[model samples]
Target: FQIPATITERYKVGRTIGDGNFAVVKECVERSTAREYALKIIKKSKCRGKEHMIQNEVSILRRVKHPNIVLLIEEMDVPTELYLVMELVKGGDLFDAITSTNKYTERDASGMLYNLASAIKYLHSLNIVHRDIKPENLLVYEHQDGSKSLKLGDFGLATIVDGPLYTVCGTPTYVAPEIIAETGYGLKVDIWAAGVITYILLCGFPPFRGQEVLFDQILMGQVDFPSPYWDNVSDSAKELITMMLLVDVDQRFSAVQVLEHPWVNDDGLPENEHQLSVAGKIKKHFNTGPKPNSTAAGVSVIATTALDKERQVFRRRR
Candidate 1:
């Protein structure tokens, strides 16, 4: 393969936005156009036998272009480092945006739901399946009207769905039953994960919980709309979630089918008038560290930083 010059040549790197074990995401400005972008620099040597993961991300991102999907503008593969210049989404991750207010509504959640469904539809159309679809991986983009939009990011676990995948890798709460069983699974895994996210966005918690019985709960795939939290939630929304959470992989909804569903699609009522008060519980579920007596399974920790610019927007609007 060919290598390019360092990313520092044309872009002025700014402060670090985020960092993982081997990759450091930094804010950068294009010297020519003065446009800002997020530059992800990955050190190949530090990848520790996971170099294929980076290659996989790069290949998938290079081929994807959708408004709901994070844009990967440029790629520079140097000898030891790979720099990926991507669109800068400053609204932070989904849970942060969800917990930003005291009042969250069905309309608010449905908009993000539609955005993610559209992204998934596009990916599935191209034979792609995002094995890891969770709130942390979904980025929120604050629009000019002070509204929020969703963008799907982090394609590290995404793969082309050439055939049924047998990988048992995914977040414990969001992983599909087939994945846990190491059975041949397909694109419906994303739908199952999406269903879990939808359930959480509405009720502020997951349908399945408890580490000991979680696998059994997920395999059984039974869900309930608990009282108080779900009293005001629209039936259309719950119906869509039930369709996605089907235990029978063959009976599960597809991304395109999810998009056409009444709750999120243009045809039906998304119920914007009544606001669902899930922010308090959402904060407890996502922002705060898990409690000792917490019944819900713990999710991965999300660092509180990375929003130098959007925080001001959120503050000013409030």
Candidate 2:
């Protein structure tokens, strides 16, 4: 496909990275710098009456910058479309990794959760809340040396909060009870989503599953952490998940509190100093590396195994 006129002439379209209800992503190269970038083009026709919302997304993206957050290179206005230039990630989305692996070990889950928690803490510092936190929105960058780094992406549902927001928005599976109830909510909602993501990463699916009626399940906070799964998950991991997914927002950990959790600091290595050093090197590779601008664009439909099937084993408990 031809590069949208809305994108600067400097960029040449390479291939489609992703497509959704509202937008399309393309791989492109900057004519001036010869650098690769992901261009997110939102068809103005689809957003014809939602200009304010698009502006909101642009505003939020421009204001937030962190190692874990996808970097926004620039925004462009073309006669036919609006383009968001973003960094390009190579490893793809967390959904891809989870689907490929079937499930993650507690050690792997801990590392991912820790990084995500740190990112959320950073977002909270700016008084922003990522209303949509899901595996599809989390990107991973794999290095040539066999190390991987994960980042949070997709901020279109994000909101900048000077105060409380009453609007309930987010993926149905990850939305918190307070939001679903239409009670006012804040950053704690992100924690709820993070907990769900953690659960899904560890067990290969979400904690709450029902037929197509996700809204009904969410409204009632219908969910559970199976003891069988919990038995293998660490106390700290279980504790954080419990705290974040708590029905009462007031009892949930603030983003900062989550960053300080013991699991985030766990090295997943033996007590021996030599082993710890080797493990530290491996962990550092996953935690620190060059980040891609956007992982969502690189996504593809990959086949999943039988274990990838979404199961509703979790039932509401008193």
Candidate 3:
């Protein structure tokens, strides 16, 4: 199927938002409503053998709708391409945020993790498993009042866990042990990914870096936190990661259990810190860190550079 060339003209493609082996995303504007949306366009040829995966994503997304989950507004299948229209997330993907900021303070990390956990719990209640839960697939957006919110995005790898799933998929860095063994896995895989995400948010990198020997590290469930890094890390955070990344699926934390963990509690950041002040500090911290060396970051004018010739146009219009 060939995408209509007119799509470029119909929706004003502002800037490239994301890219993958098979697809590309851009910020687009709906001509009729003057509303903004993220347009994910993929060539059908690239997804030839994965049509069912695409269909499953569409099916699952259509059935699940929650504030914390990215909503799929529409799906367009032309002769040569497929187009997915989703909510425009101005804050960007969590991976880019983490990479740019290096790491997040306990309070901010907990807040984001709670939002994601809540979303995943809701999905589990609906019998759906978001097989892919890496930071790159998670998005952050600000609400109308400027409060930060998170949404679980990218459902291409999602599966309805009615029975055992055998596919050995998902990013190696976040894949659960059971999945790597080819032993039938279930929702626990997602919990493991969540654990990895939480660990990375606090420590500036993943506990288990499956860099060169991906399968070996993942299969062994090899993970560790250095003394210095773990010293300042909250006990609740460590406990939650332990539960989620448990080697045994039977012993691993469930999405519901994760929500009950002290780290996700709404009362506070689990440690002696002012909640509001910590939030402000985290934002300021990211603002001061090395900016993303990319065009999208340039469009936001998050950092000033001598050669930054691009004008910032994506700012919310007052």
Candidate 4:
């Protein structure tokens, strides 16, 4: 449906905050309270096969009103558009935070992971699974250093599945093996994504790679902590990642376990010489696989001269 000629009575649409494949997100202010929100406008034609997915996403967002998760204040369904009003997060995605720091530390990752784990655990208790759990989907409250408050956003891919979900979705870099197999999957998928993120945090790169061969690599579920990077990383953190990355859902770590893990525990957190290597190489493979020299990348962004000029140059040179 098309947006009403005007929507100023309720909200004053501000600058466009984000752009997506099927939606346009703008910063809007409520008329009554003047409170700001991230307004997402999705056209009907764009969500054709996944219309029901929108409803499920909204339901989950409204049901869970936790501090760590984005809150859906309201929604307006027009003939051609579905507008979703959610909390405004200024700090940008978690990955930006990771790369912004001069020296990423294990303690920092532990705290962020704990925050996300607790949020996921709460959603699980409510029977909702956030199918997408990549760093891009996790947002922060501010850009300042020190304490970071992660607020999980973008429930467009979240849902309440009874037993398992068979759809192959989510970013290729973080998708679990079950998703690639086309077999039904459940909450364990989220754990796998977390494991991938953890690995990236510690070493500033992913454990698996290969675009055309991504499925096989994930299916194999073999992750190695190579030297220079992992050498300084603590074994405790590695143990937790091992539990989360387990190929078998039965053996994978749960959200609850993540919260209990010593790495996440405040008193249990350790900051030895193992500070994350957040130097120049932190974003070496931001849009590719863990290994920069490898021809096979687990995930990649479409390279366009207009959209990714630098990336396109690098891709061509490679």
Candidate 5:
């Protein structure tokens, strides 16, 4: 009750903006500056068995202060709940914003990947491994000049890489082959996941297909540039994806290597024109309908729908 009164005096916590299985997000305003924030109220009872993970998330959040990563302004603790006050990020998640937009360009995708790679590089430099990297966790932020930027959020599954991590956790499409094989993994897992996101950004569909054979495909590491869909994509873009998606951990590109790649470092290769078809495909993937199974389109549609629905619950938002 005392802490509640203190929070009440400092912030005008408003209505619930979103919620997860164990947490609820509210729009709160700091009384002193009238600045907006997302207040995540976590019920300890709901996190009965996974309390340590949440605490670790808080620790990671507190330690991070990067331009491309969400900022946790403050934290509060109570007997029944844990409150995380984070900076408000507008423009929605990456996939949703890209899908809704009228125009998406290869250059735009390149810029997005550059920011993400830089963010991941920074994390790895600090010995942190973001085990989960997906579209849902990547937020889109629009500047006053109308230029857009990407911010990585939701550190719920992120952990410091003390040693080779053996945790079998991450979204289905984004999980690295090392994780699938139950082998010890390190920061490179983030690079692998980033590659998956890169493939989706360029093509509007995942690199692997189907739920049953997804892990096998990732392990095999034979990514394809299916005709028509990837016909317009630049060769350098495909080359970078190939490097990141490699199954062998030693062969996989590090975040620094990805950043240094020609496509990301000097982005003249990627076209600046509208990738309208790719955007359309993303929308179709999001709002899936029954399509016959004989075509590549149908396969991607089925796989995207299946994998999106099957992802483990890791919901943190602002």
Candidate 6:
């Protein structure tokens, strides 16, 4: 059929880029501007029967626009579908990129987190909480200076709660302590998730993970930045991670604190002459052309293989 009038007849639709259980994001181009965008069509009929919550989130998604966050170009509301025209990010999610290249470095991790924290800072400023902030929602611009450019996306779990949030909702691996404490939380949970992202970026797995150990360990808020994995990671990086992962809500790093941290603010690459040696940078760069494809190699060289074996053993036992 002709470009659906559901979009004011101003754009032509294209193929889908994202297909999930309840929504479909297709490629579309604005006729007037000739600009391409990702069009997310949400079916309100299926929101786990929470269309009202979905509607509230849609309004907030429209507000979450920043250099480091996904830009909602425009939207159309109809009885059957809700269309969200968004910036088309070609790089895909951070997790898939990591698993594909199987490498990331301290500098690489810092660069990605800088953008993520920047986005979180913007969202928090808007009084919005991204109840979910994980690798899956973090997308990289593949065309950009390569892995260094990342943008936070997916505002499905976002909310504009003015007071403390009593409802706990987040991925198990990245959930913050206060979320489970049932003591209620504000926007600090986003910072906590950012800390978890930092942890995962450093080590291939989350700081507090492993199927059943997730919630209990998250409640305990302990992280093992054990040797080998964290050895070459800078003191500044570890310091920031420590602050972000603190179990005490009062002590956790805020979005502002993350962006303020030297680790996130400083130009990721410092002259090795003064910057302590880490990541075998030069040799690897010469070999791999500036991309952080060695992060996975670093993990493999360390205890990653052992962790894999343990996972297999656990799976069989289950």
Among the numbered candidates, top lDDT falls to 5
C-alpha lDDT values of all predictions? 0.74, 0.65, 0.68, 0.70, 0.75, 0.65
Candidate 2 lDDT over residue span 1-318, tens digit each? 345564657787777777766677777798888988777776778777767777776787788787777778888877677777887766667754443332235656666777788889988888889887877667776667855667877676677788778765666678777776666888888998998887666555566665336656665554576765455555666677777777777887887777777766656521212111122222332232223334443432111111122332232332
lDDT of 3 at 228: 65
- Per model, state how many residue pairs clash: 0, 3, 5, 7, 0, 3
lDDT score of model 3?
0.68
The whole-model C-alpha lDDT of candidate 6 against the native structure comes to 0.65
> Which tens-of-lDDT digit does each residue in 1-318 have in candidate 5?
133776888999887666566666776799999987777777778677766777777888899888888778888888888787886766566675566555778888898998899999999999999877787767667788977777887676778887887767887788888877766999999999999899988888888875547877877888999998888888999999999999888989999999999999997877887563676667765543222111221112111111122244222221
lDDT of 6 by residue, 134-205 (tens): 775666565534444677766656788778887667777777777776678888889888898777666665
If ranked by TM-score, best first, what sequence of candidates would result?
5, 1, 4, 6, 2, 3
| Over 4 Å off, model 3 | 1-27, 31-33, 41-50, 77-82, 95-104, 210-217, 272-318
On a 0 to 100 scale, what is the lDDT of residue 101 in model 5? 57
Model 1 whole-model lDDT (C-alpha atoms) = 0.74
- For residue 9, model 2's alpha carbon misses the true position, in angstroms, by 5.7
Question: Candidate 3 or 6, higher TM-score?
Answer: 6
Candidate 4 residues 18-121, lDDT tens each?
56666667767888898777677777786777666666666676689887876777787787787777777655566666765555678778877887898899
Candidate 2 Cα deviation (angstroms), residue 114: 2.0
Candidate 4: stretches off by over 4 Å: 1-10, 19-21, 31-34, 44-50, 78-80, 143-146, 210-212, 272-274, 288-318
Q: Which residue pairs in model 4 clash with each other?
A: 1-79, 1-80, 1-81, 2-80, 210-297, 210-298, 211-297
Model 1: how far is 163 from its true place, Å?
A: 1.4
Worst lDDT 10-window in candidate 1: 307-316
The alpha-carbon RMSD values of the candidates against the true structure, listed in the order shown, are 9.4, 8.3, 10.3, 7.8, 8.1, 8.8
Candidate 1 clashes between residue pairs 3 or more apart in a chain or in different chains: none
Q: What TM-score do all the candidates reach, one by one?
A: 0.85, 0.74, 0.74, 0.80, 0.85, 0.77
**Worst ten-residue run, lDDT, model 2?**
300-309
